[PDB]
């Protein structure tokens, strides 16, 4: 926002009348640019967790697992990221502007593919040093042994686990394509930001006690000695409105920063490794996680192992 | 609380690598942690296998991985190269070796048999 232009609107008389209010304009500009610069820090702390842009090998022999619907397509971006970008249904007129993000969605969709290609091909290692290749079934056996179940239980059941993983990826793709209100946690943020800007722009049709709500009108049909007080009323009202907007934006940006911190920690500890924290990444025992880009956030797909069909035994 | 008083197993929470220890330091208006971490280097590539066929049984490692430098099979820890002869004291066994996808044939020693002679 530009305070001298939102408030006055290219009226030198109003500019002179407002210059006597200290440096409120510079302070609001400073706060807004602070949060605008903090958003890019949020993004680079969540996504730029990798050192090199790993790549996936053309031969896909990952022990029978189908990573086709999460790995990127040479069109851009994966299939699930495209479904996500479709699941959301998102100006510059008077002193307002929308800066672009530093990282285009292409670069974010490239980061979330480097991470995925490194997770499928090396496992825990690429987050702790160099990438040490390992066949996928052996990495999955390491993970099973990590959750407390011996490795032979995988090698005896490789086909069934591959089939269950494929059917679960299908389930997720369907539950995304069909159901409404999927990304409500992002549509909510977009709606809140847009409604705040809408209230700000609509607060320009108020009189606050003046004779009119347009400044050039009072400028036209009145004398400076009297125009002073009407312009002052409009000025103090518009200043109060701009200040309210800035403060609520500060609070909301602090909340968004906390959420991006949570997401950065979840990326560092569930994608780069295997979390032993209960119900931190999914319901059940954690095996692995795959990240996915989004319109204005991130989507984790946690693969977990859940026991079933239990029996009763006598113990000692 | 979780890096100075103990050893965190959380990835990239207290360094870049595997956490060994941490030392705190005071500051003008804050704190400065110095995380001591362990990072592997000078990797080498070997041939691998999930199990081993031996007289109709499938032998899986106990702690480590089966490796081969082209000729003969050893067992190592997954984080360092320290090879050892494949014996029965470090490879358990479960089931007949027709099911596991990619079993290699090899020999598994039994340190009791030579002591019998």
């Amino acid at each position: 926002v530009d305070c001298t232009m939102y408030i006055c609107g290219d009226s030198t008389e109003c500019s002179n009348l407002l210059l006597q209010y200290g440096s409120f304009c510079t302070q609001l500009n400073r706060a807004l640019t602070g949060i605008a610069v903090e958003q890019d820090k949020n993004t680079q702390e969540v996504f730029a967790q990798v050192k090199q842009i790993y790549k996936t090998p053309p031969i896909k022999d990952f022990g029978g697992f189908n990573f086709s619907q999460i790995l990127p397509d040479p069109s851009k971006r994966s299939f699930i990221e495209d479904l996500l970008f479709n699941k959301v249904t998102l100006q510059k007129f008077n002193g307002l502007t929308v800066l672009p993000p530093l990282l285009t969605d292409e670069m974010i969709a490239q980061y979330t593919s480097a991470l995925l290609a490194g997770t499928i091909t090396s496992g825990w290692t690429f987050g702790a040093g160099a990438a040490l290749q390992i066949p996928f079934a052996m990495q999955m056996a390491y993970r099973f042994n990590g959750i407390g179940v011996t490795q032979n239980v995988l090698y005896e059941n490789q086909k069934l686990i591959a089939n269950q993983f494929n059917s679960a990826i299908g389930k997720i793709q369907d539950s995304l394509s069909s159901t409404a209100s999927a990304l409500g946690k992002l549509q909510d943020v977009v709606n809140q930001n847009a409604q705040a800007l809408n209230t700000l722009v609509k607060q320009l049709s108020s009189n606050f006690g003046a004779i009119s709500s347009v400044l050039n009108d009072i400028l036209s049909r009145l004398d400076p000695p009297e125009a002073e007080v009407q312009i002052d009323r409009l000025i103090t009202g518009r200043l109060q409105s701009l200040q309210t907007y800035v403060t609520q934006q500060l609070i909301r940006a602090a909340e968004i920063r906390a959420s991006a911190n949570l997401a950065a920690t979840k990326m560092s500890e569930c994608v780069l490794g295997q979390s032993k924290r209960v119900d931190f990444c999914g319901k059940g025992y954690h095996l692995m996680s795959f990240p996915q880009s989004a319109p204005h956030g991130v989507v984790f797909l946690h693969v977990t192992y859940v026991p079933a069909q239990e029996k009763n035994f006598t113990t000692a | 609380s979780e890096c100075v008083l103990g050893q965190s197993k959380r990835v990239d929470f207290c360094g870049k690598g595997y956490h060994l220890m941490s030392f705190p330091q005071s500051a003008p208006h804050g704190v400065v942690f110095l995380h001591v971490t362990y990072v592997p280097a000078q990797e080498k590539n070997f041939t691998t296998a999930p199990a081993i066929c031996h007289d109709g049984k499938a032998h899986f490692p106990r702690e480590g991985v089966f490796v081969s430098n082209g000729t003969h099979w050893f067992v190592t820890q997954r984080n360092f190269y320290e090879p050892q002869i494949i014996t029965t004291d470090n490879t358990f066994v479960s089931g007949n070796c027709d099911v596991v996808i990619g079993i290699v044939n090899n020999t598994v020693y039994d340190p009791l048999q030579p002591e019998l002679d």
């Binding site: 090998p57 502007t97 292409e106 | 060994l20 942690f33 990072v39 000078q42 990797e43 070997f46």
Partner: protein, 385 residues
């Protein structure tokens, strides 16, 4: 361009980065005026130069429309005693157009001439005449006892209310009369009030303006029939209705307007404005500086080396081809001192390698290195009181 940084940051040396120094707006020129066609003088003489003005009980009112009204030929004269305009500047009425004009006229005392005003109490203010909690055009009261010095009579009523009954209202008739004689407290004054309306209908009455020619597709300043504005005028696919004089979307700003002389509808849009931002490599290193106009197509402006990016237009920096690490962020995939100039590239995310993956090969380390990494965290701020 650099000095604005040294002024916005109140310093003689500024570090690297990208600062916001000011805005820019293409200032308009050749202001136009667009007033109606009908240009004939209005007969105020048949209003102010009358002699038969009714009393305070049936104070007269006449309407005025369908002409052009010279106001600076009356306001600047010594012929009136009280010429007080409420809400309008008397020297400006030759730029504002009105929809109608209501000239009310009567004859009252010279002492009670002060009670014709909104916010005053008294006899006629409460029983004969009143004005609402709003403005009228002006009050014009002139001493006319020379041509007057009984036949003038006067009595909870509302603003602009008429009491025609003269009946006794405990038998007492309330009405009373004046005295016309050159004998100060009762010397009569002939008083009129002019009432206007603003921006409620098509206007017909206003002063001698030029109604200059029209322009199109240019950031111009217009005085469009009392509605003053600035912007670029374009043609509309949209169409108004026979009962539409102007339009708007949100926030009271006029977005479209029909002509008063040609009935043609034009669209009004804000002409190219934006912010300016100066990318500097730091004053201790050098003194050259690049500049970027936010959300601007630089078909509207120096232009020594121009690069149009998704963030705006960038002048002073050369678009280099090979990606490097990000030095100074610009936005939308661009990041920007190398080889005596400033360069603007597309930043890259890192080295692009591909691990050799096979279903029977593994990689195991043989050596190791222990490292120490620092991490700083603030725990307190200053305890201001």
């Amino acid at each position: 361009p650099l000095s604005e940084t040294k002024c916005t940051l109140k310093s003689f040396t500024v570090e690297k980065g990208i600062y916001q120094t000011s805005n820019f707006r293409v200032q308009p020129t050749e202001s136009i005026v667009r007033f109606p066609n009908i240009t004939n003088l209005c007969p105020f003489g048949e209003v102010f130069n009358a002699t038969r003005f009714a009393s305070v009980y049936a104070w007269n009112r006449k309407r005025i429309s369908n002409c052009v009204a010279d106001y600076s030929v009356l306001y600047n004269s010594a012929s009136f005693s009280t010429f007080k305009c409420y809400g309008v500047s008397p020297t400006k009425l030759n730029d504002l157009c009105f929809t109608n004009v209501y000239a009310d006229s009567f004859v009252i005392r010279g002492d009670e001439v002060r009670q014709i005003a909104p916010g005053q109490t008294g006899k006629i203010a409460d029983y004969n005449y009143k004005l609402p909690d709003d403005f009228t055009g002006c009050v014009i009261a002139w001493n006319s006892n020379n041509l007057d010095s009984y036949n003038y009579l006067y009595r909870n009523l509302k603003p602009f209310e008429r009491d025609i009954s003269t009946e006794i209202y405990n038998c007492y008739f309330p009405l009373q009369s004046y005295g016309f004689q050159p004998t100060v407290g009762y010397q009569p004054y002939r008083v009129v009030v002019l009432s206007f309306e603003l921006l409620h209908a098509p206007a017909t009455v206003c002063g001698p303006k030029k109604s200059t020619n029209l322009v199109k597709n240019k950031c111009v300043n217009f005085n469009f029939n009392g509605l003053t504005g600035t912007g670029v005028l374009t043609e509309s696919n949209k169409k108004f209705l026979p009962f539409q004089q102007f339009g708007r979307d949100i926030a009271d700003t006029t977005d479209a307007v029909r002509d008063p002389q040609t009935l043609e509808i034009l669209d009004i849009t804000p002409c190219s404005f934006g912010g300016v931002s100066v990318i500097t490599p730091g004053t201790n290193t050098s003194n050259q500086v690049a500049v970027l106009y936010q959300d601007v197509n630089c078909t509207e402006v120096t232009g020594s080396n121009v690069f149009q990016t998704r963030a705006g237009c960038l002048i002073g920096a050369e678009h280099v081809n090979n990606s490097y690490e990000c030095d100074i962020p610009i936005g939308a995939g661009i990041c920007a001192v190398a080889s005596q100039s400033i360069i603007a590239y597309t930043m890259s995310l890192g080295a692009e390698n591909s691990v050799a993956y096979s279903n029977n090969s593994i990689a195991i380390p043989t050596n190791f290195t222990i490292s120490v990494t620092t991490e700083i965290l603030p725990v307190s701020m200053t305890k201001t009181s």
